[PDB]
Design a protein around this ligand. Structure first.
Ligand SMILES: *[C@@]1(=O)[C]2[C](C([O])=O)[C](O[C])S[C]2C1(Cl)Cl
Lengths: 245, 246
């Protein structure tokens, strides 16, 4: 399945970044990575968890349908971008944490556990509170597991209805051209401490002509100013592969 | 109950074009157009027909599923961009006529007629050739009918599985930002002469924040260099309406 490509470290060392990129053409059966060990090391998913959380909210009927609006109650939120009504797509795209915290509460620990089992989602440990397990709790997943998850979603092979998978897929589109389509989701757990840094992610897949490439990136982050690297490092790697695009 | 907004006409005259723009906020119960008469006139749909044709291809099973690949057999095609295997979205986005002529033949006249009736698609006249009725045959549809069809698609209300309607919607995404998403399709019947012009279209819808706007534009085309007006005239109107830009 997985092979090391040590040329890809240039991008990490340039920035003194401890991280991993996993990139798979056509399927998870052929991945390459800069760091064999870290590729299956597991980290808080943070807001990449909105992908399965959204699927689960639709499957359970907690989210009515693709057209549900999540209204802002006018009360303060941690980000200005979350202070307004958001569609499902909008709430994923701006990573509106409190929308999904309330979705998780309505889903409930029994159903959330059930679904993460069906999804083979990381260590499947949702302890730490129903509305914060993926943010500061015990849930962990690796970049390889993300790429496996995203591939099932791409093929509509998760245990949820095909309509709900397609709904979340359109919500993930972040770049659209006549012959190049990108689906992707960022994550950022916070800056932690210098001793125990946070994690940042970018995961998704690229459709180019008739090919597909799945990717998952994570890195340790103790400084918010380093945040863009979660897209720029994978972007430069994929550009050097001719994928981007 | 469509209203006329004549102030939009200066965007057409400025470019010496005759055409119509229909724009509906929230639903087709709230539409506005520059030209009430041309808004209901019916024109050859050209490549805009790839929308219903794709849904029908999926419903009939001619198109196997969303990941179907349409293989190029190597024989020459009008455009290099068509001379390659294509996904369903790639074939729509580059408007690869030959892939859809073949889907249309496989669907055949009986089933095609039946879906166009279910979809209330234009004059529903597909006569004269199953693989060109939308390119140079008798099929005709108005800008108001395009917006009503597209709203149905957006709402998953067409007579087709929700799943196939979702497949086709993703294939129509042309613009994407975190709170702005555009689904659309161009079409162009060919450059005509001044007295017998072709038609160019741009149809689709825009989700901005939590609002949705359905739109359909067409214009007479008798000069090839004017083709890009099919996008810049409606773009300018949507700017002045405050949909494009903050
Ligand atoms: C989720 O992890 C989002 C992060 C992300 O990756 O998008 C940041 O968004 C820029 S902050 C929000 C949280 Cl941290 Cl919950």
């Amino acid at each position: 399945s997985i092979t090391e490509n040590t040329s890809w470290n240039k991008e990490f060392s340039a920035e003194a970044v401890n991280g991993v990129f996993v990139l798979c053409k056509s399927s998870s059966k052929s991945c390459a990575t800069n760091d064999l060990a870290r590729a299956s090391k597991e980290y808080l998913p943070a807001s990449t968890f909105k992908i399965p959380n959204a699927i689960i909210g639709l499957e359970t009927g907690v989210i009515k349908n693709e057209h549900q609006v999540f209204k802002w109650d006018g009360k303060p939120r941690a980000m200005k971008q979350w202070e307004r009504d958001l569609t499902l797509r909008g709430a994923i795209q701006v990573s509106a944490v409190p929308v999904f915290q309330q979705i998780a509460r309505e889903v409930g620990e029994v159903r959330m556990q059930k679904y993460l089992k069906k999804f083979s989602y990381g260590n499947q440990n949702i302890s730490g509170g129903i509305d914060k397990f993926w943010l500061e709790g015990q849930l962990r997943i690796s970049a390889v597991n993300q790429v496996e998850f995203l591939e099932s979603l791409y093929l509509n092979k998760l245990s949820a209805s095909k309509e709900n998978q397609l709904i979340v897929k359109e919500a993930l589109v972040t770049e659209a051209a006549p012959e190049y389509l990108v689906h992707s989701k960022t994550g950022f757990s916070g800056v932690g401490t210098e001793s125990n840094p946070g994690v940042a992610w970018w995961v998704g897949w690229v459709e180019k002509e008739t090919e597909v490439y799945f990717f998952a990136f994570n890195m340790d982050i103790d400084n918010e100013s380093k945040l863009p690297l979660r897209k720029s490092i994978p972007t430069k790697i994929m550009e050097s592969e001719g994928i981007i695009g």
